[PDB]
Amino acid sequence: TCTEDRIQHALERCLHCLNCWSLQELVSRDPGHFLILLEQILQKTREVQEKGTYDLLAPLALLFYSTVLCTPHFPPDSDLLLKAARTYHRFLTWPVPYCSICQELLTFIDAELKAPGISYQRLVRAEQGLSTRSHRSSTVTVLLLNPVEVQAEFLDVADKLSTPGPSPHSAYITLLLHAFQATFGAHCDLSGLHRRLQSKTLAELEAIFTETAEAQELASGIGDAAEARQWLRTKLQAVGEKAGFPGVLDTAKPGKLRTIPIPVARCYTYSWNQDSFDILQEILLASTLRVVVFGSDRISGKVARAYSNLRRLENNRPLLTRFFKLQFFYVPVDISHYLGMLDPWYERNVLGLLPILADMLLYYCRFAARPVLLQVYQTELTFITGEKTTEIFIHSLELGHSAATRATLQIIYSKGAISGRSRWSNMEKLCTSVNLSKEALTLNLTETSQIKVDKVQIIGSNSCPFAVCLDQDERKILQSVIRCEVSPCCLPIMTFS
Amino acid sequence: LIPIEFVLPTSKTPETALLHVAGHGNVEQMKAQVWLRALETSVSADFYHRLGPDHFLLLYQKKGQWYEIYDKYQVVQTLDCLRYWKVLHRSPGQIHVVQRHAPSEETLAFQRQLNALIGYDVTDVSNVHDDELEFTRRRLVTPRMAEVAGRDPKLYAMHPWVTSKPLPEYLLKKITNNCVFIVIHRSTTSQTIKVSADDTPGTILQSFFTKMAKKKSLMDIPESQNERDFVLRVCGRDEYLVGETPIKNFQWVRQCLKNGEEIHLVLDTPPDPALDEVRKEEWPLVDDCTGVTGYHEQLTIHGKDHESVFTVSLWDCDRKFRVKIRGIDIPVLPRTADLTVFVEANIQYGQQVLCQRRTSPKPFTEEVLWNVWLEFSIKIKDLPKGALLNLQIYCGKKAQLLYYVNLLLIDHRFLLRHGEYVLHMWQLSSFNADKLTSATNPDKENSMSISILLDNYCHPIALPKHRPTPAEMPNQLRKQLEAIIATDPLNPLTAEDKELLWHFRYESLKDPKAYPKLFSSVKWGQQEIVAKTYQLLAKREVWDQSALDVGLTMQLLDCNFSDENVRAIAVQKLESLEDDDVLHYLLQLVQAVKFEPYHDSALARFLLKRGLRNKRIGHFLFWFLRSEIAQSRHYQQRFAVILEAYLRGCGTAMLHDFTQQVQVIDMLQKVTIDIKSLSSQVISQLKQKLENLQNLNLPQSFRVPYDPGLKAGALVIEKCKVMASKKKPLWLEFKCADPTALSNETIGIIFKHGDDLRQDMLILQILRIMESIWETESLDLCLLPYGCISTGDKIGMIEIVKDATTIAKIQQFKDEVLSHWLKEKCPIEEKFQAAVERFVYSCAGYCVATFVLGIGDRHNDNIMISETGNLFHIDFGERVPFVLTPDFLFVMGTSGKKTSLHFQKFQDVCVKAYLALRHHTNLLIILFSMMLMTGMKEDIEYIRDALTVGKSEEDAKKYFLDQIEVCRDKGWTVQFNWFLHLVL
Numbered sequence A: 001t002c003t004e005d006r007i008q009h010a011l012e013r014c015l016h017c018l019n020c021w022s023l024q025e026l027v028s029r030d031p032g033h034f035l036i037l038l039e040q041i042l043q044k045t046r047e048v049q050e051k052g053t054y055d056l057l058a059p060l061a062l063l064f065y066s067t068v069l070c071t072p073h074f075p076p077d078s079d080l081l082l083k084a085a086r087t088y089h090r091f092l093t094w095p096v097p098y099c100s101i102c103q104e105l106l107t108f109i110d111a112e113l114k115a116p117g118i119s120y121q122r123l124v125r126a127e128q129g130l131s132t133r134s135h136r137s138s139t140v141t142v143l144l145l146n147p148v149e150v151q152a153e154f155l156d157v158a159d160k161l162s163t164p165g166p167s168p169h170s171a172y173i174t175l176l177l178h179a180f181q182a183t184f185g186a187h188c189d190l191s192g193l194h195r196r197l198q199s200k201t202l203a204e205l206e207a208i209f210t211e212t213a214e215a216q217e218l219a220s221g222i223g224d225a226a227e228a229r230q231w232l233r234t235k236l237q238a239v240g241e242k243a244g245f246p247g248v249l250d251t252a253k254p255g256k257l258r259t260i261p262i263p264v265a266r267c268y269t270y271s272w273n274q275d276s277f278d279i280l281q282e283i284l285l286a287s288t289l290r291v292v293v294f295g296s297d298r299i300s301g302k303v304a305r306a307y308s309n310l311r312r313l314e315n316n317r318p319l320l321t322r323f324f325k326l327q328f329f330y331v332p333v334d335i336s337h338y339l340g341m342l343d344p345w346y347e348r349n350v351l352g353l354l355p356i357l358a359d360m361l362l363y364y365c366r367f368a369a370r371p372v373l374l375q376v377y378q379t380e381l382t383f384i385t386g387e388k389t390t391e392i393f394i395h396s397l398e399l400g401h402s403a404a405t406r407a408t409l410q411i412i413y414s415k416g417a418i419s420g421r422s423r424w425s426n427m428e429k430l431c432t433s434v435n436l437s438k439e440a441l442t443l444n445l446t447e448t449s450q451i452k453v454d455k456v457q458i459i460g461s462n463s464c465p466f467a468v469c470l471d472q473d474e475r476k477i478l479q480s481v482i483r484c485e486v487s488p489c490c491l492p493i494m495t496f497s
Numbered sequence B: 001l002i003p004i005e006f007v008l009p010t011s012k013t014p015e016t017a018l019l020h021v022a023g024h025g026n027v028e029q030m031k032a033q034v035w036l037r038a039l040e041t042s043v044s045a046d047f048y049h050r051l052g053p054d055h056f057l058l059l060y061q062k063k064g065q066w067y068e069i070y071d072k073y074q075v076v077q078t079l080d081c082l083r084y085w086k087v088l089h090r091s092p093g094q095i096h097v098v099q100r101h102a103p104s105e106e107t108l109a110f111q112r113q114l115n116a117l118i119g120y121d122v123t124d125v126s127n128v129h130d131d132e133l134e135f136t137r138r139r140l141v142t143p144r145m146a147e148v149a150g151r152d153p154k155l156y157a158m159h160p161w162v163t164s165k166p167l168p169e170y171l172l173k174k175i176t177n178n179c180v181f182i183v184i185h186r187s188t189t190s191q192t193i194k195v196s197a198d199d200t201p202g203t204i205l206q207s208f209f210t211k212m213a214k215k216k217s218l219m220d221i222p223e224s225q226n227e228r229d230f231v232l233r234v235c236g237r238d239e240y241l242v243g244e245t246p247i248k249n250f251q252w253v254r255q256c257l258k259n260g261e262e263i264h265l266v267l268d269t270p271p272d273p274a275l276d277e278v279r280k281e282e283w284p285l286v287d288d289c290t291g292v293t294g295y296h297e298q299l300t301i302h303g304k305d306h307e308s309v310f311t312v313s314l315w316d317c318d319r320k321f322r323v324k325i326r327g328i329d330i331p332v333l334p335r336t337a338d339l340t341v342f343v344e345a346n347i348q349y350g351q352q353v354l355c356q357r358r359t360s361p362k363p364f365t366e367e368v369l370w371n372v373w374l375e376f377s378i379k380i381k382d383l384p385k386g387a388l389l390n391l392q393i394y395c396g397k398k399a400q401l402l403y404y405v406n407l408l409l410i411d412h413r414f415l416l417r418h419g420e421y422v423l424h425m426w427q428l429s430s431f432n433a434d435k436l437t438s439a440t441n442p443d444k445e446n447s448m449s450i451s452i453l454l455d456n457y458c459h460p461i462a463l464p465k466h467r468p469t470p471a472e473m474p475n476q477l478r479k480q481l482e483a484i485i486a487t488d489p490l491n492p493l494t495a496e497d498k499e500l501l502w503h504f505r506y507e508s509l510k511d512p513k514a515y516p517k518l519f520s521s522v523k524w525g526q527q528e529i530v531a532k533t534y535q536l537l538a539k540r541e542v543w544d545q546s547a548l549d550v551g552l553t554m555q556l557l558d559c560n561f562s563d564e565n566v567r568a569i570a571v572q573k574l575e576s577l578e579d580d581d582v583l584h585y586l587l588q589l590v591q592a593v594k595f596e597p598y599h600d601s602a603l604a605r606f607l608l609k610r611g612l613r614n615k616r617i618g619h620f621l622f623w624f625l626r627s628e629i630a631q632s633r634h635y636q637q638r639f640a641v642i643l644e645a646y647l648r649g650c651g652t653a654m655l656h657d658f659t660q661q662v663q664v665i666d667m668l669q670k671v672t673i674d675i676k677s678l679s680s681q682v683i684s685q686l687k688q689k690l691e692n693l694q695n696l697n698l699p700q701s702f703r704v705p706y707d708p709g710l711k712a713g714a715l716v717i718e719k720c721k722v723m724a725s726k727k728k729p730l731w732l733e734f735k736c737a738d739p740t741a742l743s744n745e746t747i748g749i750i751f752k753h754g755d756d757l758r759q760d761m762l763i764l765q766i767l768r769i770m771e772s773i774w775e776t777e778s779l780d781l782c783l784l785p786y787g788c789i790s791t792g793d794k795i796g797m798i799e800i801v802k803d804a805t806t807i808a809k810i811q812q813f814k815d816e817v818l819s820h821w822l823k824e825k826c827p828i829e830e831k832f833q834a835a836v837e838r839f840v841y842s843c844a845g846y847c848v849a850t851f852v853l854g855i856g857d858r859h860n861d862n863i864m865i866s867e868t869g870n871l872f873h874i875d876f877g878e879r880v881p882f883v884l885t886p887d888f889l890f891v892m893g894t895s896g897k898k899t900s901l902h903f904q905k906f907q908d909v910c911v912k913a914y915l916a917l918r919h920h921t922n923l924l925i926i927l928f929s930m931m932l933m934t935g936m937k938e939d940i941e942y943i944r945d946a947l948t949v950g951k952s953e954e955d956a957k958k959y960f961l962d963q964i965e966v967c968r969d970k971g972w973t974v975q976f977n978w979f980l981h982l983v984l
C-alpha cells in the first residue's frame, strides 16, 4: 500500500535528527500504523539475527520500546508480541551488552503481554506524581539554563514545558481512558467513557484509578498470558459495572480507536549562570530527578567541573540523594565530541541540535537509560603553609610565563604500556613554562617539546612563587605551590547507547 | 527445593541445620545461604560471624571415603552427591561444613623433599592464567590410590623381570636335553645343580632343600628355616628370581645363555614389604563428576524461557568467531632497523589451520597498538574441543617470524574463553613439538606481550557431551579402497580419497589397519561430522579383538590426532603391552605426551599406573620425566605434576633411593663445574675435589641411574681422570657395594657436561628396539647398545665399556693396522677366529642401522671396537651409506676385489637383516617421525627412499647390495674429509 510503503522508507531514514521525530509524527496518525510499524521493525531484527550485524541492534531495540508503549490496542487475532518475544529469545547468546539489552526487552514484553497497557500507565503516573500509596513513585524534570548564553529559543521550550497544562484531575481521566481502551479495544465507548468520567470527582477518580492500577500489577504476576488477560478483563469489566458505566465498555458495535498521546511531564526551570550546582540544592526549598544541563563549548569544561565536583561532593556528603535518585542529561546548544564518537544514536538525535525541540527533548529524557562515565584526572596540590587540596581536572593544565599571561622544578614521571609494564623516571628540569596537554597526557616544557606521560609529580624549589591553572581556569588559581601530583582516576550522564 | 542437612561445626553436641536449596543454585550461593541459617540458628553467633563462607570445605562420605567438592562454579543439581544419595535412597543427605586448616610441619616438610627431587616447585601459581594444573594434582589422586592399594607386596619389592616371548632359534640349541645348570651359593659353599629349563623357581628350591637336607650342615643354611624362608637372588645384583614362571622365561637367564656364562645364584631372605609403606594421603578425594557438563538437550536455550536460562550450549551459537587484537609491547627493542611488523591469529586443530587472519603493517617500535577486531569465517558452534588460538608476530621490509603463543579456546571445563588476556610470547631462533605449547613465557621482563579481548557472555557457553545413539560396493571402488588402506603411513590422502574413505566409513571400520587413515579424513570443523564419528565409534568390536600392532597404536598418538576419543582407544589398545614391551617404548610415550593438548589425559594417566605397579618402569620413568623438567621450558609444568603424582606412590624405599642418586648427580655436577671453569694441576685439583667429595658424605652406595639392579659403592680415586676433551668429561670409576659379587671388577661411568644427551638416549632406544626386531626373526646381529642418560641441564651419565678402544687410536691411514691390532690382543687362533666372527656380525648391524636412520656418514674418530672384536659407535651428536672403510673388510679376508668366506657372510647377513626391518616399515616410520619432531617433511622423506617402501623384496635385496658396493669404492676418502675439516 501507499501508507505502508511510506512507513518503510521513513524507518530507513531513522536507521542510517528530525527523521526519528518525523517517524513518530507519521505513525501517530492512526492506531493501525503502530501495528504495521511493529512488523516492519521486527522484520529488520530478523535480518540482523540472520547476519550477526551489531551496529544496528542498538537502534532497533529503542524503537520497539517506544512504539509498543504508544500503541493503543493489540487485537486478539494479531500476536505480534509473541513473534517479538521469540525473535529476541535467540539473542541471549550474543556478547555483552547486546545480550543484556535484549534480556530487558523480554521482560518488557512479558509485562505488556500479561497485562496490556501496564508500561504506559507506570511511566505517566510517575511523571505526574499521582502514585498510589501501595506503590509510590515520582519523576521531576529540572532544567538548568543560562539566559545570558542560552538562546531564547531553548528558553521558550523551558517556558512551555514549565507551563503546567495537565491538571491532576485531567491526568486521572486520561490514564483511565488508556487503561480501558488498551484491553477492550474498539468495543469501548470513548465518548461515553470521557463524558461520564468528567462528572466524577477527583476523590472517586483517584480511588477508581487505584483499584485499576492494583489489578494490573497483580495481573502481571499471573502465569499464563491468556488467563492473565482474561482475569484483567473480568476485573476491568467489574470495575466499569461498579463505577456506573458498564455499557461504555464491551459495546457490540465496534468504535474507532483513539491514539492517546503521552502527557507532558512536570518540568521546572532555573537560571544556571553559576556553574556550581548549589542551585540544585537550593531547589530543594527511589523517585527519580531528571537534570537537564544545557552546555556550550567553553562551559563544557566547567560543566564537567561542576558535574564531577558536585558528584563526589554528594558521594561523601549526600543531601539531595535523601529525597531523589539523581540522573543527569547533557544537551548541547568537549563532552559533545566525546559522545559524538561513542554514541552515534545520541549523535543524530540530540547532538544534531509544543515545539519540535520540546517533543524531541521529552522523548530524549523518557527512554535514555545507558549511563556514561567521563574521563577525569585527579590531582593533589600541596602548598607551603601546611595546607593540601584535592582537585579534578580533565581539559589541560598550564603554569608559568605563558600561563600567567593567559590568566627549577623537580619532575617525576611514570609512563606505562598496554600490558601493565611501565618505566618510572626522575627527570628534573628548569624552564619558564610547563603545561600538561591532554587516557594519557602529553606534558609540555617551553625551555620547546612535548612528551607523552601518564602519571606525573612536580615539586617546587624553596617556596618559589608560581601560579598554576587547572583546565585554563580564570578564577581558581593556586600560587606559590610546593607540590602537585597528577594521576588518572549514582548520578551519571545518560546516553541511548 | 532440594533438601540437604549440613552438620555445623560447633554444638553440647554438634548442631545440624536442614536447608532447602535451589537445584540450579550455585554452590557459592549455597555457602552464603548456609551462612545466614547458622547466624539465625547458632547457639554462639560469634563463632560463625568472625569466620567466613570461604574458609570451609564441604565434605561427604561415599562408601566410607570422604570427598570434597573442589569446583565452586557449579549448580547443586549437577553434584554427584545427589545422585549417590538418591540411588541409595538417602534424603536429605549430610554435608559436613568443616573449617579449613593450614598445612602442618610434616606436610610442609614432605612437600619440600618432593620439590627438590622433581626440580620444580609444583605449588607455584605465578605463571598460570587458569587453574588447570591444581585441578590435575587433585584429580590424579584417584588413579594412584587404587593402584597403590592393588599391588602385590612381595612381588613388588622383589620385582622379578620376566618375559613371555618364546626362546629364539639361537638359544634353543644352548638348552641341551631341556636342562640348565645353576651355581647355587650359600656363604662359602658354591655348588652346581642341574634342573629342567621349564622348572619354576618355587621348585628349584624344593629339590635343593631335599638333596641338601642331609648335607644342610655343610651349606650353613639355618636349620629351622625351610625352603620357603629363602629366595634365590642374582649374586652381585639386586635381581631376585621369584614367582611361578619357567626358569627360562626370565631376563637374566636369557642374557647369560646368550653370553655362555653359568648362572650364579645365592640364597637370601625376602625383602621386607614393610619398607615400601606410603604416606597416607592429605588431600580429600575430588568429586567424580567434574569433567561432565551434560548433553546438548540440557545446555540449549531453545525449548526454554529466559526465566530458567543458566547455561548456553556452544552449538546454539551461530556467529562467526571474533577476537580483538589490541597491540604488543617489547620493553627494549632487540634491534633498531627499518622493518615493519604485523600480528596474525589462527585457529588450529593439531597441525590443521582451520582459518587465519592478519592486520595491517605498522612500524616495529617498542609499542604498537591496533585495537582491531578480527572475525574468522568459522562459526562459534563449529569449534572442536581442542581448538588452539595461535597468535604469531611476523616481520618484513618475505616475512620473518619472530614470536608465537597459543591459547585454548575451550579450556579444561568445556567453557568458551571470555575476557581479557595478556600473553607473553616465545621466540623462535616448518614445525616442532614445542610449537603446540599452551604455556606462557615465564620471562615477563624482556619478552613481547600481546593483549587480546574475547567477548563476554551473560551465561557460561559450555560444550556438551555427545549422546551414544544407534549392498557391497563395485569391485573397482573396493579395489581402490584397498589401495588407499595399503600405502606408506607418510603417504597423504587426497580430497577425492578422503571422500571415498569418509563416504565409505562403515566399510573401513571393520578393518583395524585402516583407522589412522579413516580419521585423517573426518572434517572436524563441523558439528555433525564429529557427531557422526562418535556414533561410528560406539561399536568397535573389531578393534577390541584385533591383534595389537604397536605401529598402528602409535600412529594414533601422533600430533594429527587431537581428539579425546580417537586417542582413548589407542591408549586402551596399549593397555595390553607387557612390562618388557613397555620398557622399550617408554622414552617414546613420554616424549609423545608433548602432544596431548590437555594435562590430564589417558596417556599420562597410563604412564603412572604402569609406573606404580612395577619398579623398573618407575625408575626409568623418573629419569625421563626429570630430564624434560630441567631443560624444556615449554612443558615443565605438565611434567612436574605428572612426576609428583608418582613420587607419592612409589614408597619410602625407592624415595630414599631416589634421594641418594640425586645427591651424587648434583655433587658431581659441581665437580665438573670447577675443572671446566678453568697443566697437571688440573689432575691434582681433580684428586683433591674427588677426595674431598668422598669426605663430603658422598653416599656409600647408590643404584646406578641406568641399571637399577647395580649398587655402586665407594669411589676408586686412582683411576678417575679428565680426558683430553674440550668438554673435559670425568672418567669416573666406582666399585660394587655387594659382598656377594663374584668378581672384583669396577663400574666405569663418564660424567659429561656441555652437550644435550636427549638424542643419544633415542638413537640408542631406537637401536635396542631394532635389536628386538632382529630377534623376532631369530637373528643375533651383535650390536653394542651401551647405557646412557640425560639428567639435567646439558649433563649426562654415560656407561663405560670395559676393554674398548677407538679406531682413530687403533690407527694412531694405514690399512692393515686394524687386523693386526686384534691379532695382538688375542694371538690365540681360536680366540682370533671367534673374534673376527663378531667383528662381522656387528659391522653389519651398524652398516644397517646408521643407514636406515640416515646418520651413516660419520668420522673415524667416533667409532670404537672392543678387544673381543665387537665394533660399536659412540657420540651421537656428498653422502655414504655407512662407514665401511677398507680396514674393516681387511679383517674379513678381503682386499681389492676379492671375496672372502666372511665378506659374503657379511653381505648375506647384512641383507638378511635389512629385509627383516622392511617387515616393520610402518613402525620404523612412526618412530622416526615422532623422534624428529619431539627430538631435535622433506627431512622425513629419507626413511622411505632408503627403507624401500614401494618396491618388492627382490627390488630391495638388490637395493642394499648395490649400497654395500658403493662404499667398496669410497674406501678411504670420506674419512679424509672428516678429519680434514676437524683439523683445519
Ligand SMILES: Nc1ncnc2c1ncn2[C@@H]1O[C@H](COP(=O)(O)OP(=O)(O)OP(=O)(O)O)[C@@H](O)[C@H]1O
Binding pocket: B723, B725, B726, B727, B729, B750, B752, B786, B798, B799, B800, B801, B804, B805, B806, B861, B864, B874, B875
Ligand atoms: N660408552 C663408552 N664407553 C667407554 N668409552 C667411551 C664411551 N663413550 C665414549 N667413550 C670414550 O670417550 C671418548 C669420547 O668421548 P665423547 O663421546 O664425550 O667425545 P667428545 O670428546 O666430547 O667429542 P669430540 O670428538 O667432538 O671432541 C673416547 O675416548 C671414547 O673412547
